[PDB]
Amino acid sequence: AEREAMLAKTAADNRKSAEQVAAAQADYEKEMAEARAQASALRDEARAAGRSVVDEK
Amino acid sequence: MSIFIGQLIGFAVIAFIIVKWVVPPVRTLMRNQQEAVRAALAESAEAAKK
Numbered sequence: 808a809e810r811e812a813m814l815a816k817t818a819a820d821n822r823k824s825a826e827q828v829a830a831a832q833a834d835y836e837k838e839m840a841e842a843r844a845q846a847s848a849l850r851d852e853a854r855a856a857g858r859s860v861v862d863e864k
Numbered sequence: 865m866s867i868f869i870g871q872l873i874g875f876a877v878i879a880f881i882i883v884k885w886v887v888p889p890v891r892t893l894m895r896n897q898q899e900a901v902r903a904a905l906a907e908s909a910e911a912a913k914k
Contacts, residue, residue: 810901817908824914 810904813908814904817904817911821911821914824911
């Protein structure tokens with residue numbers, strides 16, 4: 808029974824590992840993309856504020 | 865006396881036959897299964913490490 812357990816769990820752990828490398832890659836990429844998107848939005852807001860201040864002045 | 869000896873020679877022949885032609889397949893069969901199980905334990909260990 809435990810022979811079986813080990814074989815199957817080893818299967819799922821190599822599964823976990825193969826899925827977890829992809830999950831770490833995807834999560835790092837998602838966090839990086841979110842940070843870059845927020846940076847771009849901050850730069851765009853800075854440009855919009857510059858346009859507003861130049862227009863008002 | 866004579867019967868014992870003759871059946872003892874017969875047992876010697878049987879032992880030789882099994883050791884030469886029956887022992888190699890079975891012992892090594894068990895042996896191959898053994899190798900397999902140990903290497904499976906090994907794969908499990910590796911996966912745990914992974």
